[PDB]
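hey can u run this one w/ sodium ion bound, need the C-alpha cells asap thx
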Amino acid sequence: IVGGYTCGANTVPYQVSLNSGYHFCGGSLINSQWVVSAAHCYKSGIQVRLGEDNINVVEGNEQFISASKSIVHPSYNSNTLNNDIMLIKLKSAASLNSRVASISLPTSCASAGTQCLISGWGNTKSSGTSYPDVLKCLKAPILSDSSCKSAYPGQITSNMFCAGYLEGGKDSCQGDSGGPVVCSGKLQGIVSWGSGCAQKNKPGVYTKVCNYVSWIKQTIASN
Ligand SMILES: [Ca+2]
Ligand code: NA
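ok here u go:
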C-alpha cells in the first residue's frame, strides 16, 4: 500500500496472508472454512495465516491453517486478468473471534464515489521497494468507469472497476494482490493489477465481487 497508514493490530479482522514459506498474497475470510483471493495468486501448498498484524513476529493471535483445495474461476484469463478470483478451502475451520472475523458478500454493486478500505502487506513505495511488516490501510473511492477505461483502453471488462487517486500518490501495489476492498461493510473488490503503483492517471484495478456472488455461494456449498 503506498500512501496508506498503519491499520492497528487486528482492526481488519477478515484479512488473511497466504504463505508458501513467505507472504506472497492477501485474501479475505468469508466464513470459518473459505477464503477468496485473486486467481493470479494461485499456488499449490498454501498456508493461510489469520489474526496477523506483523507477519514476521508471532504475537499470539494467529491461526495458521493449510488449504485443502483451491478453485480458480472457470473463466479466468491470465492474459487479461479477466475473472481474477479464486476460493480456498481451509483444512480445518478457523475459530472466529474478535481478531478473526469474516466479511459479508454484497447484495448489490457499489457506486462510483463510494469510499472503501484497502489493506495489505505489500510494497509501500511508488518508485522503490519497501515492504512493511505490519498491515497498512488506505481509504480510496471507486472511480467512474469512464476514467478507468480512459486510463486503460481496451483492457477493462465489466468484471473490473478502478479505485484510487488519479493524481497518484495513494494505491495498492504488489504483495497486496488477493486482498480486500470493503465499502459499506461488504467485500466489493480484490486487488488485481494496475500500472506501477501510485503513478498519476494509473489507478488500481480490482475484481468486481458483486458479479460473482452466485458462483461463490454455489461453489462453497458443493465443496
Ligand atoms: Ca504475527
Ligand atoms: Na492484501
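The chain is about 5% helix and 30% strand. anyway lmk if its weird
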